[PDB]
Amino acid sequence: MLTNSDREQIIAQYQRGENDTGSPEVQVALLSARINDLQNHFKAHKADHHSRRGLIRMVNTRRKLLDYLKGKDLGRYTTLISQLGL
Amino acid sequence: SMQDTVGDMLTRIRNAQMANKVSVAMPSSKLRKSIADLLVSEGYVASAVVNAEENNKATLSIELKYFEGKAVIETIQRFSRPGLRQHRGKDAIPTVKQGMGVAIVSTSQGIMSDRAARAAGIGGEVVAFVA
Amino acid sequence: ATTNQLIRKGRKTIKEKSKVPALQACPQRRGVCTRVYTTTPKKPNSAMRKVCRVRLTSGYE
RNA sequence: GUUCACCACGGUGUGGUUGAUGACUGGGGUGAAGUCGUAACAAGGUAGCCGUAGGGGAACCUGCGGCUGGAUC
RNA sequence: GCAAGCGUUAAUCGGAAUUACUGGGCGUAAAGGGAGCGUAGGUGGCUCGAUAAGUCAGAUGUGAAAUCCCCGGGCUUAACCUGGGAACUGCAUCUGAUACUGUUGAGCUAGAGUAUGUGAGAGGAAGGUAGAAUUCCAGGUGUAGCGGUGAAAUGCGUAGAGAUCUGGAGGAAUACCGAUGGCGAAGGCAGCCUUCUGGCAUAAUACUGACACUGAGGCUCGAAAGCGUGGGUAGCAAACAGGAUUAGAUACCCUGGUAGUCCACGCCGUAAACGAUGUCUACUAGUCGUUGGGUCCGGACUUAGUGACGCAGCUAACGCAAUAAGUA
RNA sequence: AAACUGAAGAGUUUGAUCAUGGCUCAGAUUGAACGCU
RNA sequence: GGGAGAAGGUACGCUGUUGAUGGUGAUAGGUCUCCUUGAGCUUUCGACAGUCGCAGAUACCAGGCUGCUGCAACUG
User: Fold this and answer.
1) Which residues of B touch C2 (CB under 8 A)?
2) From CA A36, how far away is CA A40, in angstroms rounded?
3) How far apart are CA A65 and CA A31, in angstroms?
4) Does B84 reach chain C within 8 Å, measured CB to CB?
5) What is the DSSP letter of C22?
6) Contacts with B84 from chain C: Cβ below 8 Å
7) Residue B97: helix, strand or coil by DSSP?
8) H helix runs in C1-61, sequence order
């Protein structure tokens, strides 16, 4: 999983201000890193169905946040998914 | 979640009077205060004062009345719910208890009783029936 | 049965068919007797009731 | 007038849908003083029921899992 | 009782609130999808504005005549005819209003989320290992029974059983703990250990600022049984075989026993998949337990679960009753 | 002046009951048919 | 995968005009070399118009095709 050291590094790169950690950009960035990290766990444990329900949840959460940005600030959205490759 | 703020207000009043509570309190709003103010002026509740709380929040406290140990508001039902809004013209306002009750109507001149809307010759959204 | 559910599906009552299909919504039909017999009624009571099997002008027998 | 173009009838082939009929066959129902049993209702005399599988003249039986809409405890 | 008609049949509406918009239901009478995620859609917090689409009002045009209803007028009355109204819910176009819905600008934190610290757990996946016990194989002791039943018998045993001791093989399940205890969306999940991994609970601060709820189709997961291929196979055990019981006994009971049960990868997609109770909100007497926290002073309080009662209320009744079947 | 006036239930499941729920009936109507007159 | 060329249809010669296109590349402009233009030759497709016959895949050449059913899986 993601450690504290790198988790704070993604926040520091997607900061919308001083130690916010709550903006749609930082949340989507945190979910994106977490989702990609779990791709290694599910490659070795594909029968893990109870953990995968958790993975879908943050995939669903990330989609809801991206929908919110697209409706809120289009420029903030097209730029964010350019960095995250979504 | 909560999707009927007006219905929540009436439900709080309906349950509080069923429980013989002295007063009922809830987070405030201009629409809630406007209906609560009409209930005061119609004579169904004692008073309704808004207290400004912190974090730009407010509390609307309504003092209830009881007559011969029975709640003054015998029935308070919601007519125009969010799932089906009810707007009526000046001649289609449904009366409550043959004029005894109040059909709270939201007109372009604000929240007022059905007898007031007919006197003003104006329709609106029939938001509730209180008797 | 919400408001949104009623404006999507809607109440559909069903009309009953005629209990006398051979008449074809006519008060009377003429026919030709192909058999004039007698038969016994159902459980509660007993008799020899007279029945005629008739082929009607509507194509029903 | 001739000829070409368009075109109706009509013809040809191959499919689709649908009605009536069809030896035989499947279950459904009704009908008497039938034949075989007695599956369920009481703990119905092996608690019953659900899903599934195997078996059996027939109700049904048995296995696995589940339920109480199971009495006695 | 009707009467120059009266009955019957056909047909429509009614009664039928028996498709319930007005105006019904879904614990047990028919009826909650097995559970979840989610698309379209439906609905949606607070405050200050803008707009006026919905909404409301006014005006104008139109809504043919007839019909219906009201006030009259002519047939001797009536049916009939007829004058003027009213109505024709509507549609269009302007004007006004701005409480609500719609569309928008800005702002807010109370719904929903994020970061940080602790905590509990049979949550999931992959490996490893431990101890009982059964079965089998091989020996030592030992001799006439063992097993089973309500009784027996089949069966096993003088080729030495059963019992007892010592070794070896193998598979499956994990006694006690153990608990209306816990975790999981449901299905489900119990020896112990490591690895990978999901959610939840909890105090405070910081942050985003309605990002929400539900959800047709869709997708995912989904007990047991069953199917495919490949392994394994101790116990139990469908089928099957025998012994009984019986009138019969394709059963119940007895002795065996194969598929299956176990493993890997895939199908199947169903259960009384049940709380026979969809999900999410807010509110409404109380009492006593219990699990994981937290804060105070052995108690007290507050949370999120999980139970037993018990008001009001609801219910045909049973009964439910802050984990509602109450109020919305 | 007026057009603004309108709403009934019963029988039948049971030893009896309440509920549910179907069936049937009493009303009005017709370009009607048929029977008697 | 197939069945399937299932079945069954329409056009087809010559003459003239005309559109598109692949190849090779002389002549020029910027060393078994490279780029653009492209003469001549050549390729494959169309359209329109006319014309002759009984007949235009004209000769030789060159599947007949369907329905039911037994058997064996098939190539061999």
Assistant:
1) 83
2) 8
3) 10
4) yes
5) G
6) 3
7) coil
8) 3-6
For every residue of B73-92, DSSP letters joined together read: -S-EEESSBTTB--EE-TT-
Q: Are B80 and B123 in contact (CB under 8 A)?
A: no
- Token pair for residue B83? 């799932």
Quick one: DSSP state of residue A4? H
Contact B120, B107 (CB under 8 A): yes
B62 in Cβ contact with B94 (< 8 Å)? no
How close does chain B come to C14, measured CA to CA in Å? 27
Q: Does residue B126 contact residue B93 with C-beta atoms inside 8 Å?
A: yes
Q: Is A35 exposed, middle or buried (0-12, 13-18, 19+ CB in 10 A)?
A: middle
Question: Resolution reached, in Å?
Answer: 2.7
- CA–CA gap between residue B63 and residue B41 (Å, rounded): 13
Whose CA is closest to B77, among B101, B49, B43? B101
